[PDB]
Amino acid sequence: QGYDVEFDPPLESKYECPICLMGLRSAVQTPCGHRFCDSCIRKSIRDTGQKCPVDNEVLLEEQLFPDNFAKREILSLTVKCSNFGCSEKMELRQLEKHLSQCRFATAPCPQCQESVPMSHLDEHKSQHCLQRIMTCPDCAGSFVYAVKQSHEQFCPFAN
Amino acid sequence: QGYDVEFDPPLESKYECPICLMGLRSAVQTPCGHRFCDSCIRKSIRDTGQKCPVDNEVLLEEQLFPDNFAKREILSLTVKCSNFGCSEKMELRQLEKHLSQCRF
Amino acid sequence: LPRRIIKETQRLLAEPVPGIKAEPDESNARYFHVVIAGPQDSPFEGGTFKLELFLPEEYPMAAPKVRFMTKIYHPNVDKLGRIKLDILTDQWSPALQIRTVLLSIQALLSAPNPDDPLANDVAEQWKTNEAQAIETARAWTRLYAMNN
Amino acid sequence: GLPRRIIKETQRLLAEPVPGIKAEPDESNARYFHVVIAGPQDSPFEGGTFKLELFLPEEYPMAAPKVRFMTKIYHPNVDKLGRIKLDILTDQWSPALQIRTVLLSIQALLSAPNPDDPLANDVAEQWKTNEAQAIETARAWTRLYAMNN
Amino acid sequence: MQIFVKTLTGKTITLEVEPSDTIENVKAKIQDKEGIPPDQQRLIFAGKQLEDGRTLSDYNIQKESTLHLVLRLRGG
Amino acid sequence: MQIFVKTLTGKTITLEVEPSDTIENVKAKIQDKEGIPPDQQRLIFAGKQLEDGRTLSDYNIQKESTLHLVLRLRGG
Ligand SMILES: [K+]
Ligand SMILES: [Zn+2]
Ligand SMILES: [Zn+2]
Ligand SMILES: [Zn+2]
Ligand SMILES: [Zn+2]
Ligand SMILES: [Zn+2]
Ligand SMILES: [Zn+2]
Ligand SMILES: [Zn+2]
């Protein structure tokens, strides 16, 4: 359940969740002095029993607290985009914001729900994506490139 | 009241107490999300009031918890002796052990 | 001469702020001779105001003691140089340092407040007659806070 | 969905091998592991190479891996079916534990047999009452079945 | 541009921003690195109390400039 | 001196010792670094469980040798 993302430099084990083995998503510390993802440790309390997994001390839903100091230092760690050609780095914090406008990202089409690279979705109006809306040359009517064949009924433009 | 000592490399800001400005003795963290010595923050709630010193946010005796994770990390930092011509280096943990058997 | 004070001293001696000067007395290590400059776009342009700052036995658990030893026409500063400032007036934090105090004093000169006054007479004129109160502030700057 | 935990663990087992423990995933199933552990030093089993088979259930790591010996081994805590009487695998499993720590414990178990908490009752009984004979048969079983494979 | 900020404790944080960033944003980017909510921040620069709506270019802040953080002006 | 120890999660730490140290005080240096109390630690090396009474030189441990730490709750 933790932060699954390529860190560079790679994640120091102090921010590594000993259950899921990732960057600590909503990090929580135990009284015995343990760092876990809230979600992970709370399942470990559910299915494995009421104990800290690492030292066999006693543990419960209540007495764990959020390590807010550790969580912020976590989101400041530099990470790489997870789309193909990205070649770019940023703080983990703004991975989400960057994936919106990744240069090399893949975005399904508004019109054709065929997935398309962000660079080329700009070029995916002029060159017809198969449901893109052509404007008749020499009669001036709006129709969807899918339905051309039937518009060839209606270029008998009176006066 | 925090760990007054020559750290080497020198103490980084994350283990420094905003109140005393020294290594976090028996560190405690707020739910607000910052750190203080147990003694120091508890004195800040005695006198300066029920607030976090660094944010003006709510803070009570109850919701302070010990950042035990931080405390080790701190005791694992290497430090120098404080008697005159010593120059021995060690993990902070055994500073008191060494100053019992120290030279000057 | 407790550690918090010593570190804080040599911290602000090495990192001095634009137009804030603060040095301990040779005699007492808790008494600081302070001068803060009149800020940019302020009524007090070109002014150099002395201050007596002192650290009490309590410090840092209590706020420092601060007075203006130069006369200044200002609705939050009385004729004795006593100061109405949130930090050291009432709710204080032991996180705060001399550095932050002195900055907040500077920030007070940048934003005079008639609605949270100490000098009741000044703030009255400051609210109803801003223009004149500012001109008097400038006049007091020029008479008292130059070449001292 | 081949959960990161398992993957991360897998490529560490190959890259940072524990001395005398080999563990590789099956070419078909990523959760199934062909293991070989060495008969440890000064033991009954020294010189031995023992095949085991370890499998990760879908619960993992919230439930323990299921592992058995495929090689025949005279040991009070391993039955004829190759099931192992070792706490880690029974109750009070912990999701902090990893495959490495399982296999290391099995290696340890070969150095330190336990007749008092038996599984092969015939063997443990032998081990308590006549230890030298049991240990000598142990080296022979090692010799017959855990060399040249 | 990279600009310096001194928190209450005295240690120095450096932040990446451009001149068309509002103070609002600077306080939000301070919050992310120090946990102090935007309400509870007051930034001083060159003895001037910086306001939320306006931008870095409105106070002509340049590269390598040091902002200073203090607590909210809650006069009493 | 300066021995290696692989904790439960995979972390590799280093501990300064001398050969005539007991396993007991080694397990103490683990607790100081990693929070696990000595009662819950089990130390493995070349497939042997290291016992609390004996020393490191009694098991022929040396420079840069990697101990492995695992958990207890045994005999089940
Ligand atoms: K930390
Ligand atoms: Zn986790
Ligand atoms: Zn624990
Ligand atoms: Zn990208
Ligand atoms: Zn399309
Ligand atoms: Zn047409
Ligand atoms: Zn302190
Ligand atoms: Zn010494």
Author numbering:
A (entry chain D): 55 to 213
B (entry chain A): 55 to 158
C (entry chain B): 4 to 151
D (entry chain E): 3 to 151
E (entry chain C), F (entry chain F): 1 to 76
Paper text:
One E3 ligase with a critical role in many immune signalling pathways is TNF receptor-associated factor 6 (TRAF6). TRAF6 preferentially builds Lys63-linked ubiquitin chains by virtue of its interaction with the Ubc13-Uev1A (also called Ube2N-Ube2V1) E2 complex following engagement of receptors. Both structures show that the Ubc13~Ub conjugate contacts both protomers of the TRAF6 dimer.
In an attempt to improve crystal quality, we expressed and purified the equivalent RZ3 construct from Danio rerio TRAF6 (DrRZ3). The central RING dimer is very similar to the previously reported HsTRAF6 RZ3 dimer structure, and an overlay of the RING domains (residues 62–122) has a main-chain RMSD of 1.0 Å. The contacts between the conjugate and TRAF6 are comparable on both sides of the dimer, but the structure is asymmetric because there is no density for ZF2 and ZF3 in one molecule of TRAF6. The α-carbons of the two symmetrical RZ1 complexes overlay with an RMSD of 0.4 Å, and both are similar to the RZ3 complex, with an RMSD of 0.9 and 1.5 Å. Because the conjugate contacts both RINGs in the dimer, this structure accounts for the absolute dependence of ubiquitin chain assembly on TRAF RING dimerisation.
